[PDB]
Amino acid sequence: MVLLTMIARVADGLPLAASMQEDDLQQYQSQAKQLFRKLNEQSPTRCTLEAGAMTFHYIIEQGVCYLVLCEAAFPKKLAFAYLEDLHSEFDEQHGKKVPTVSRPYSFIEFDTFIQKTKKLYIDSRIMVANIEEVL
């Protein structure tokens, strides 16, 4: 019911595409930026992480990480039903170019598609671990 999606390059950690909206995002988008740096070629291809009131949810495919952060509660097996539709469109439209670019947020225009898919998921109509462990 409340979000924070991020797509980044698993190598350097360069973020590629995000979606945020407010009406806090400061501390919480940090760890995601520090998680992104940690993730390497041993990191779990799918993994769920846990944090007090919130929760992280990311896959990794073609060498790109599709993280989303949500205030605990929110359906676990449904979160990955978003990022599967995300990774669909990313690898579809932009998959080819992801290791060629280098300006941060080079795929920002992908914000426009996160939102219409983000919401078509809020109104009703794997590995477990703790965040402070990996970081």
Binding site for other proteins (CB under 8 A): 1-2, 13-15, 18, 20-23, 25-26, 29, 33, 73-75, 102-105, 108-109, 111-112, 119, 122-125
Distance CA 88, CA 82 (A): 10
* Smallest distance from other proteins to CB 12, Å: 9
Per-state percent for the chain, helix, strand, coil, to nearest 5: 35, 25, 40
* Smallest distance from other proteins to CB 73, Å: 7
Determine the residue type at 18: A
26 backbone dihedrals φ, ψ, rounded to 5°:
-65, -75
Nearer to other proteins, 60 or 79 (CB): 79
* Smallest distance from other proteins to CB 47, Å: 23
Whether 19 contacts 111, CB under 8 Å: yes
> H/E element holding 87?
helix 76-89
Nearer to other proteins, 48 or 105 (CB): 105
* Smallest distance from other proteins to CB 17, Å: 8
Nearer to other proteins, 8 or 127 (CB): 8
